[PDB]
Design a protein around this ligand. Structure first.
Ligand SMILES: O=c1ccn([C@H]2C[C@H](O)[C@@H](COP(=O)(O)O)O2)c(=O)[nH]1
Ligand SMILES: O=c1ccn([C@H]2C[C@H](O)[C@@H](COP(=O)(O)O)O2)c(=O)[nH]1
Lengths: 260, 259
């Protein structure tokens, strides 16, 4: 019922001091795991208000296979601007690898479509995998992939997804990542004719930045509310979902906490 | 602490029955954690064939696509898949040592990782991937231990493996010992102590034809782990089988992989 907050508390109390690329100190643990039963509720956080619009649009953008911020801008989303070129380009980041992993043949692999196929025709496959960690291409990316690699699993007509995320800004970043992949899992399940199972979040370096400590204590003092419910309009292709096809119902968070 | 045996028990009791030719019990997203300071996680509840483990890893480090070097040393675990020339495709070690970049250049992920460990231990990008989406079809089969990350805190090197598919009875004992061993080498080459080895799996399964063997293993009292000693070397690529001594290994009898 509070996998994120449990993890957040554990790292707060138990994390090891560790210097960071950004010059801010962190407390961190390595190899941590959160598990959500999606059937019980949609894990958009209630102990602090999370901006779902940013989440949903970024995901739709990924599913386009889009390396340009343009389409995000058409929709008022600016979360990627900082890193873009004067043309708006970011290099072959997430979505580009999801939809268009360049194969030696000179062709391209749509990992999203490949996975949906497997889920429909061979649900017991243990190879239903999407990777964004394209070693040869990472240098051309504005940023190395963070949520790097994910797998699907099917049991009893329920779809599960496990994400491997190599680095996790537990306070500022992870709440978006959880919501994003949960959303992805609903979209995949709907398109594969399955229901939702578990979302499993597995992290590499899980850290609380030193300048978020007070914000974390605030958030940990709050009693979680019941989770909202996720609803999707009917579509016959994952690539046809729009922002308007998604509804987050009964989302009742505590107030947003702004970070320094 | 016996994370392996715990996991085995857990999957045996709560696993979902499934298909694939043999059926399995399956759980998804299971994690195991070993403090390498406390001992080398070479299983004591059955004799684990470490010879095959150690040689396989050394073979990986070589970047070798062909099984020749493994026969040279008596190891037959990869036979069932080789071509008549004994090639396997760009499996594990090819990806570790020479991931083909679009530039025509090859990336040595091992050296890159070692270099970060020496140069920038705080890095959260210290990763080796075998999951080369474009090359998987050329491989005799797709990678199981698909990729791994290193992490340093307080001079201690931890490693995390992501393994998409896990034969809990036959495969996982090797995967643990192999990545445990690789962490010791990396730590030594980097001037670090050993921290934790974290095993994270995808489809974690016991084959239906392994249940009796699994029960035998679980009735056995676990014994203290052995200790691993690595002779000195100047480079991770120069280690040899003889550099690797597992002291004080006192396992219960091996358990034959059924037919
Ligand atoms: O989807 C993301 C992307 C980034 N980060 C955080 C983790 C790190 O704190 C930082 C990126 O820093 P590096 O690990 O690359 O150094 O951003 C996330 O938490 N989730
Ligand atoms: O290092 C390895 C390699 C393979 N396997 C197992 C997992 C599966 O049972 C089988 C590979 O089959 P697929 O998941 O590819 O179907 O081998 C392991 O457990 N460890």
């Amino acid at each position: 019922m509070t996998p994120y907050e449990d993890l957040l508390r554990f790292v707060l109390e138990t994390g090891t001091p560790k210097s960071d690329r950004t010059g801010t100190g962190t407390r961190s643990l390595f190899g941590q795991q959160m598990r959500y039963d999606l059937s019980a509720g949609f894990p958009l956080l209630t102990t602090k208000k999370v901006h779902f619009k940013s989440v949903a649009y970024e995901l739709l953008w990924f599913l386009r296979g889009d390396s340009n911020i343009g389409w995000l801008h058409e929709h008022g989303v600016t979360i990627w601007d900082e890193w873009a070129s004067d043309t708006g380009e970011l290099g072959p980041i997430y979505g580009v690898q999801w939809r268009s992993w360049p194969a030696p043949s000179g062709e391209h692999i749509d990992q999203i479509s490949a996975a949906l196929d497997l889920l429909r025709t061979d649900p017991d496959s243990r190879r239903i995998i999407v990777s964004a960690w394209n070693v040869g291409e990472i240098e051309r990316m504005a940023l190395p992939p963070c949520h790097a690699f994910f797998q699907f699993y099917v049991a009893d007509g329920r779809l599960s997804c496990q994400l491997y995320q190599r680095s996790a800004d537990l306070f500022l970043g992870v709440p978006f990542n959880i919501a994003s992949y949960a959303l992805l899992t609903h979209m995949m399940a709907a398109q594969a004719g399955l229901s939702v199972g578990e979302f499993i979040w597995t992290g590499g370096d899980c850290h609380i930045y030193d300048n978020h400590v007070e914000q974390v204590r605030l958030q940990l003092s709050r009693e979680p509310r019941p989770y909202p419910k996720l609803l999707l309009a009917d579509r016959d292709s994952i690539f046809e979902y729009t922002y308007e096809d998604i509804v987050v119902k009964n989302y009742d968070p505590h107030p947003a906490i702004k970070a320094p």
